[PDB]
Structure 1
Amino acid sequence: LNPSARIMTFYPTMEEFRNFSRYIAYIESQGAHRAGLAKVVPPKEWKPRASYDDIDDLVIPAPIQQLVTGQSGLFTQYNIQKKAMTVREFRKIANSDKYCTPRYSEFEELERKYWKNLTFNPPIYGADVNGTLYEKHVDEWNIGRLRTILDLVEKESGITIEGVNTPYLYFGMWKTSFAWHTEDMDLYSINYLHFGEPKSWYSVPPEHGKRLERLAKGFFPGSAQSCEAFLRHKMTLISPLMLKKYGIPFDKVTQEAGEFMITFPYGYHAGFNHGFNCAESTNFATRRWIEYGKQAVLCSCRKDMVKISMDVFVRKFQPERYKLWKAGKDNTVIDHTLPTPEAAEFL
């Protein structure tokens, strides 16, 4: 139902909003997932926190300086880790005259300045901060407890993986970036921008993901040779012009404060922050993900790589396939357009 696989936007009513799992099934039934990325504007009367005036003392244990290098729309991003700092001192830096958002009229203009000045004046990104900004009693779309089947991991093994089955906070300033990547184990993610300047996103349809990898391997032959999935290192930036020039289908969308972005299995995404802002994210799953999890190609070169045992999911949700899967003979091919089984009630 999304032939053009464009990025859809949904405005759920407070009743529709209440059950998270259920609503994800609904937007998949609308074809949202085909774009790789989808936006969800929450009911006006929804708020996850009363005031963000109390966080100035919150610690960012490991702010990152993002050094980018390259030319002609192809870049590699190197992380230089800085000393800890509080949200307050970070916001002074972000708003300071050297790190703050350039002046501009339309978005396209800011986008052009980003791709022009990307390798200059390296910003700091308050990334991967363990925490949440939700109030204990928020029962709608609480990133800390979404109740999806991804809960099986910690439930059956006690295993937690920071930012994956726990939430992460990201304090951005102008010109800070996330490189091109799909999620760990090719999961879904949910991103909520608590406050501040927009965050803009690019995405390639999962249907065309393989194209983007082909392109990437040609541009960084070295990295590709050394690691089966070097894009998972999250150091590879590629401008939209470069994508256009080589025929990769992609779409754009700007996320403003108070909106959600949902990433879908094997949806490659990237983007940048407009200025000082704050976001929370974690991963989650649906039944549709299980198969992606089984076939996710994982980083083969680094020790600190996330690898979830699919075993528990295969027994509980694909019992008839388990033996065949452990014998390495499960040849299921994935149809990236099919909606998740739970969406049948909406069809």
Structure 2
Amino acid sequence: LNPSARIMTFYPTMEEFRNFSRYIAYIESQGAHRAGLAKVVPPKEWKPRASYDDIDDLVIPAPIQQLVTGQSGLFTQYNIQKKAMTVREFRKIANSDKYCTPRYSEFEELERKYWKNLTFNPPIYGADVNGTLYEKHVDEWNIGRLRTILDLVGVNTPYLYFGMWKTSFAWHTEDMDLYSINYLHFGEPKSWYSVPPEHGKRLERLAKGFFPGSAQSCEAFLRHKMTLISPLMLKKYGIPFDKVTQEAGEFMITFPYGYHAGFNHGFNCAESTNFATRRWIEYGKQAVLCSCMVKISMDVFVRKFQPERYKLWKAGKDNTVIDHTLPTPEAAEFL
């Protein structure tokens, strides 16, 4: 049951792939959740949209210029909101000489170039664009309507991310320690780093040691999604982690309390949203939030799935310690 907590890759058939929540339960029974990140390669015959040639006049309302400050594997990213631009304007800029991906042999070479140049030539990230690239009829893994227990509740809505070389997402867990689904619609790859949920507190303690002013101001400062930490720093301080490259037409699943970060190799488009399973309810209850934020009332969840614990929890007498290695109750039919 994944004792090494390494990122697992799944290749479901069309029949396996049809039920989203059932397949999430299956990958959990195989211990995929232990790494905090997993890859799901869909069947070759599956496509969420016939063509991506009609999106040139799609508006990115808040492009963000990403300014990075730091040294020795420790960085802070500052976002500068720019005025609205089209995918056409973004793609041209992305592919221009100033912002294009450098020439490289292996990923290790591109990764080294990223960590060496992330403070130079700030890129533009077409992030958090409300919308979907999923066609209407597509019933399998539709990020716009996954129909998880999360529907009981801008947390169940899809977001589009138009990336360019060196655009980054900082170290973070999902808001409310939820799950997330990320599908790379098209383009250049997206490379990820993950810290297993069982070592999430080790990363937080390391981050608190390096940014003590940021931690004294906010309890969960990593939730601001500004802190970038290189694989070499993680290695230097014995933080266990793994890395994976997501290619066009592949899904990435993030698990409750699974810390992740990464960067885009070049012009690309990803679709994302949050989702839940019965396992998340305890993570939602115990989630340490940003003081200075996305907040969900957990009462409705405890009232339906834990009616016996509702009174105890409403009082403060529910002090259940989470086991990060345990799979979702739904994973019963696969064990």
Under a length normalisation based on structure 2, what TM-score does the superposition of the two structures give? 1.00
Deviations along 1:263-303, one digit per CA (max 9) or x if unpaired, are: 000000000000000000000000000000000000012xx
Q: Does residue 1:323 correspond to 2:314, yes or no?
A: no
Secondary structure at the residue paired with 1:320? coil
Secondary structure at the residue paired with 2:191? strand
Report sequence identity in percent: 100
Partner of 2:323: 335
Q: Give the alignment of 1:1-347 within 5 angstroms.
A: 1-153=1-153, 164-301=155-292, 305-347=293-335
TM-aligned CA deviation for residue 114 of structure 1: 0.2
Partners of 2:107 and 2:64 in 1: how far apart? 26
Count of residues in correspondence between the two structures: 335
Partners of 2:291 and 2:318 in 1: how far apart? 22
TM-aligned CA deviation for residue 218 of structure 1: 0.1
Secondary structure at the residue paired with 1:262? strand
Partners of 1:326 and 1:259 in 2: how far apart? 41
Query: Gapped runs of 5+ residues in structure 2?
Result: none
Secondary structure at the residue paired with 2:318? coil
Deviations along 1:231-285, one digit per CA (max 9) or x if unpaired, are: 0000000000000000000000000000000000000000000000000000000
Deviations along 1:187-223, one digit per CA (max 9) or x if unpaired, are: 0000000000000000000000000000000000000
Deviations along 1:165-208, one digit per CA (max 9) or x if unpaired, are: 10000000000000000000000000000000000000000000
Partners of 1:137 and 1:38 in 2: how far apart? 26
Deviations along 1:128-157, one digit per CA (max 9) or x if unpaired, are: 00000000000100000111000000xxxx
Partners of 2:278 and 2:84 in 1: how far apart? 39
Under a length normalisation based on structure 1, what TM-score does the superposition of the two structures give? 0.96
TM-aligned CA deviation for residue 329 of structure 1: 1.1
Partners of 1:285 and 1:143 in 2: how far apart? 13
TM-aligned CA deviation for residue 307 of structure 1: 0.4
Secondary structure at the residue paired with 2:53? coil
Secondary structure at the residue paired with 2:266? coil
Pairwise CA RMSD of aligned residues? Answer: 0.4
Partners of 1:104 and 1:130 in 2: how far apart? 33
Q: Which runs of 4+ in 1 moved over 6 A?
A: none
Partners of 1:61 and 1:219 in 2: how far apart? 34
Partners of 1:146 and 1:60 in 2: how far apart? 24
Partners of 2:316 and 2:121 in 1: how far apart? 49
TM-aligned CA deviation for residue 164 of structure 1: 2.2
TM-aligned CA deviation for residue 116 of structure 1: 0.2
Partners of 2:285 and 2:83 in 1: how far apart? 38
Deviations along 1:61-98, one digit per CA (max 9) or x if unpaired, are: 11000000000000000000101100001000000001
Secondary structure at the residue paired with 1:6? coil
